[PDB]
Amino acid sequence: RKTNIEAYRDGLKLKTEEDFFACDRQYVCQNYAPVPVVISKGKGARVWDINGNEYYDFLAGVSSLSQGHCHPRVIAALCRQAERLTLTLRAFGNDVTGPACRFMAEMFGYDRVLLMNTGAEAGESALKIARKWAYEVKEIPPDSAKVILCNNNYWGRTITACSSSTTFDCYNNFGPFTPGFELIDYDDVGALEEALKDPNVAAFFVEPIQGEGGVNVPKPGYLKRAHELCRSKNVLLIVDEIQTGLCRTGRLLAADHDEVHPDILLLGKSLSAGVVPISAVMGRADVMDVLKPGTHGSTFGGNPLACAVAVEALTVLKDEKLADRAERLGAQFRDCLRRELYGKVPWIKEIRGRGLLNAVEVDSDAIDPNDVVMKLKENGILSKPTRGRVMRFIPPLVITDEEHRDATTRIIKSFLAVEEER
Amino acid sequence: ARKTNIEAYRDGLKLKTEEDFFACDRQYVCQNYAPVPVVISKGKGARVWDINGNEYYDFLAGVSSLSQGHCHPRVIAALCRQAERLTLTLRAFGNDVTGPACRFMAEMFGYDRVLLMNTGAEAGESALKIARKWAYEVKEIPPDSAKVILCNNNYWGRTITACSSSTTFDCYNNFGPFTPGFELIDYDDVGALEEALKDPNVAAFFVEPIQGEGGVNVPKPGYLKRAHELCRSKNVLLIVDEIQTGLCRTGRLLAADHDEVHPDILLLGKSLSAGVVPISAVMGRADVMDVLKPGTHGSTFGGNPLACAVAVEALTVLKDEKLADRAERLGAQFRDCLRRELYGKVPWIKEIRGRGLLNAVEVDSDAIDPNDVVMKLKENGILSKPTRGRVMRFIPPLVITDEEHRDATTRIIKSFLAVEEERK
Ligand SMILES: C=C(CCC(=O)O)/N=C/c1c(COP(=O)(O)O)cnc(C)c1O
Ligand SMILES: C=C(CCC(=O)O)/N=C/c1c(COP(=O)(O)O)cnc(C)c1O
Secondary structure (H helix, E strand, O other): OOOHHHHHHHHHOOOOHHHHHHHHHHHEOOOOOOOOOEEEEEEEOEEEEOOOOEEEEOOHHHHOOOOOEOOHHHHHHHHHHHOOOOOOOOOOEEOOHHHHHHHHHHHHOOOEEEEEOOHHHHHHHHHHHHHHHHHHHHOOOOOOOEEEEEOOOOOOOOHHHHOOOOOHHHHOOOOOOOOOEEEEOOOOHHHHHHHOOOOOEEEEEEOOOEOOOOOEOOOOOHHHHHHHHHHHOOOEEEEEOOOOOOOOOOOOOHHHHHOOOOOEEEEOHHHHOOOOOOEEEEEOHHHHOOOOOOOOOOOOOOOHHHHHHHHHHHHHHHHOOHHHHHHHHHHHHHHHHHHHHOOOOOOEEEEEEEOOEEEEEEOOOOOOHHHHHHHHHHOOEEOOOEOOOEEEEOOOOOOOHHHHHHHHHHHHHHHHHHHHHO | OOOOHHHHHHHHHOOOOHHHHHHHHHHHEOOOOOOOOOEEEEEEEOEEEEOOOOEEEEOOHHHHOOOOOEOOHHHHHHHHHHHOOOOOOOOOOEEOOHHHHHHHHHHHHOOOEEEEEOOHHHHHHHHHHHHHHHHHHHHOOOOOOOEEEEEOOOOOOOOHHHHHOOOOHHHHOOOOOOOOOEEEEOOOOHHHHHHHOOOOOEEEEEEOOOEOOOOOEOOOOOHHHHHHHHHHHOOOEEEEEOOOOOOOOOOOOOHHHHHOOOOOEEEEOHHHHOOOOOOEEEEEOHHHHOOOOOOOOOOOOOOOHHHHHHHHHHHHHHHHOOHHHHHHHHHHHHHHHHHHHHOOOOOOEEEEEEEOOEEEEEEOOOOOOHHHHHHHHHHOOEEOOOEOOOEEEEOOOOOOOHHHHHHHHHHHHHHHHHHHHHHO
């Protein structure tokens, strides 16, 4: 029995990928670049296009699909809960939202969980919490709160996010901007210490590995050292684990690699296994409780459907031991790429990452990075770079041993064929 | 039926009573909402049930997110069917749903370009970005000088930039420093608008056809019609927020249709998904929308195929079930009856107001405790949540049947009269 999208789409008589591309240019706000594929279905680490070609998905929603496409447990949890109750608002109680927050609070070790919808909203929320806490508990002067963040950060596309970006296309022509941000180099403890001299600082807002910035892995101890500096000044450490969290780097949180318990933790993306948007902000009671009744809200935040989904998605990460999976396969991946590609392929600048969050930065003055992207696709690997030159390898963590060996060999083959063609 | 996971995790916690749940929420959930009166376990259509099997009519409906009713079978079927196939690709890859869904909405609402985001706040943020970038690039106003006019008591969400353009104390207090670039004028005041529009740095006027969270404030006839002519006169964009008013709630497809206004930029949300998953939209002509070039905006989940499949079903339900006609007809009956039976008899009613099935009864909180009205309503089978303490809201699913609406209207009228009896 055809649902409305199916019947409608049928009537458009779209046969080729080009037919779909034309439909984007005509009707879809054109804020994303052209795409090389029209995906129709996904299962685990694999997707298929409209012509039945199979690929490994090496983007995975930039770590939103860690549990794989269409994970049966998560889809069942979705459909069962959807037959019962999807939305009450937080104006009314329900039998799911609190149990879901207790589940998360225990899993991550926080007193209070705020559920929002997108990663941007989690960042907005955290900044609001840190500002209000700074005014109310730190007693900094009215409208003086500052938040330190890093160059090449990414946390979203709200105006306030654009206001704290150093990426030209993120901010250009979108001002005037929200004040109150101090930008410093990533991976630079000395710069953080200098900025922490300002007593009106509320928080330092950081990624454990910069995501959209290029899979920038900081030096050993960066985050550990930053937390001590912040504690010294009674400044909150807000750690954005939207992309790095949830087993992706080989630990439950990327912050775990430094034994850092964030003062405020952000999650999103794979919190729902890519099924529906749900994000979370977690913290100790004497920070989070500054959000009194009426001072924050969201129509869909903490809706029971997304809660049911998230509990199942997080349980899958545990049950399937996906952190161990990510540690093991990712160390193998980087070891194979280094052995077969360094030396042999001179236009590779770096192979880096943790767990299954991996990147290969190329030198865009020695090669066209897009040739690498297209060659990957020809070998069945779908992959989207960041900043042009940073190739990304972010597969679902459920990828099997056999599938990962196959994908690894396809990836190596692609880089070597580009070098041969150069 | 076999237990669900979440039923067994929760059954593991031994939560039996509504108070066990209230405690759980107090301990683990960020405490940014008021205490709740009820623990809902199931919804179907206009009805919800608490964990004790008590039935109520849902007269909040997600503040008009559940116009198609709780658990609409078509919408749930479309969700589950698409979810078995594909949920997310990002807009970094193509898929076989997002484009067709945007074409579907483009044709339904009469726009060149559709931008899909996730929440109403994100739709507002996106619209403000589009308008500013358009002002800089097309009107060539000076850098960082773009202004946006909004109205006192507006509500568009909870981002910092939304807090920065709010006149509601709890929405902004201690969340600054604030995003600049806003001019706040009285709602429902064409003269104030005309004056604000003299400033050539204005990019847009951003307005609700009926203020939602501000208290179901219905403007005077022709307000929006007059406001658009003023903005066009000045090449200023009219951004109309229909996240709460749109989608049949006021008796027309868009509340702007009461004034025959086609917004320069339209925002939808809430019932765009029948309350099933968060999806919002921003729609506009090509020469405005196309300022958002590749890399200049984005969203992980915006336009995901699951949400698109749900939205197309949700929008089709509105048409097939003639829910605008139903809202028009039942709404008019609701306001007629409440006025006939309550005005005069109940001196602490200030006003009964609305359009379609977006209705409010503002009470005098110096003369009555408005929470007594909320509790009495609940005792009589009606779940409602006020805005601004004193503004009672009646916002049922538009699928409420003729008999259900009769029964509910009776229970509502009964509750106001019982509160007045008790005052006496
Ligand atoms: C991959 C993305 C964006 C994808 C896209 O916009 O196509 N990352 C989003 C992100 C965000 C924003 O999340 P969103 O609003 O996209 O849910 C926050 N924090 C971190 C560390 C992030 O990496
Ligand atoms: C009912 C609400 C908020 C409910 C809540 O936060 O509990 N309205 C949200 C809203 C919004 C924000 O939508 P949200 O971010 O909550 O999806 C935008 N525009 C209008 C006219 C709106 O009424």
